[PDB]
Design a protein around this ligand. Structure first.
Ligand SMILES: [Mn+2]
Ligand SMILES: [Mn+2]
Ligand SMILES: [Mn+2]
Ligand SMILES: [Mn+2]
Ligand SMILES: [Mn+2]
Ligand SMILES: [Mn+2]
Ligand SMILES: [Mn+2]
Ligand SMILES: [Mn+2]
Length: 204
DNA sequence: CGGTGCAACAAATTGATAAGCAATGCTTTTTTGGC
DNA sequence: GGCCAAAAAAGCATT
DNA sequence: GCTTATCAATTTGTTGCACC
């Protein structure tokens, strides 16, 4: 129950024959590189699906039509993996874990009435060191938003005196930014094996 | 390529509970690039 | 596409 | 060990992207 960058590019390939494997492969790499770049430097504002397609077109001369069908598939394969209980691990970027959460005390932040947070399975993103370094080294860039899949943004970490967990020595840590992912609705419902039933849909 | 419409977004409230993390060396997994 | 040695990244420790 | 994130329900304003 673990899908790597390669095992994923393999599934996208076997489902995109009209597209050469080496291309189906370069694409995934370019996307993750565009994504990583966006978060660290960004520049071109928020990254979207149409930005990742245009880039593929520009960088790999790939037809826009196929570039779009891939980007979409790319995120669709990951979703498929996760909902199956599989964790997606992408080298040089980050891993997408699955965690089963037990019910805990909640409430209505507005009213204050105790309303418990049901047990569920949530998807989480763990930024690799490679990527984390870029974000702090670059000084942080823009964000990424892929509807139905999830969003990537940068969170600020104020400076603080930290400890070498081994020696106990203090170390001076500078403020920095770090990547943060928020699963999209479509991904939260498919991944959470506690809601694949009668959906929630009433008007009052 | 350019314009619309709308559900999926971000942000905002409290507060008990869960998850992550500062340095760094050894181990292990993954990828890389030639054949 | 598979084999392989090396390089890179992640993993673990504990994070 | 200390610090950051999770999440509840609901409103207000923004926006990605399917679809003309
Ligand atoms: Mn693994
Ligand atoms: Mn162009
Ligand atoms: Mn299944
Ligand atoms: Mn992991
Ligand atoms: Mn955030
Ligand atoms: Mn490393
Ligand atoms: Mn342990
Ligand atoms: Mn502890």
């Amino acid at each position: 129950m673990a899908s790597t960058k390669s095992e994923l590019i393999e599934r996208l390939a076997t489902q995109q024959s009209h597209i050469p494997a080496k291309t189906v492969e370069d694409a995934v790499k370019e996307m993750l590189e565009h994504m990583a770049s966006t978060l660290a430097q960004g520049g071109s504002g928020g990254l979207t699906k149409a930005e990742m397609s245009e880039y593929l077109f520009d960088k790999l001369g790939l037809s826009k039509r196929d570039a779009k069908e891939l980007v979409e598939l790319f995120f669709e394969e990951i979703r498929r993996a996760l909902e199956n209980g599989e964790q997606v691990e992408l080298s040089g970027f980050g891993n997408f874990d699955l965690r089963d959460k037990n019910q805990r005390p909640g409430r209505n932040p507005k009213t204050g009435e105790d309303i418990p947070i049901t047990a569920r399975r949530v998807v989480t993103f763990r930024p690799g060191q490679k990527l984390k370094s870029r974000v702090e080294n670059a000084g942080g860039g823009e964000r990424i938003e892929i509807r139905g899949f999830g969003s990537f943004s940068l969170h600020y970490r104020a400076p603080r005196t930290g400890r070498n967990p081994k020696t106990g020595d203090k170390v001076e840590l500078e403020g920095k930014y770090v990547p943060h992912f928020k699963p999209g609705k479509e991904l939260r419902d498919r991944a959470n094996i506690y809601g694949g039933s009668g959906h929630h849909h009433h008007h009052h």
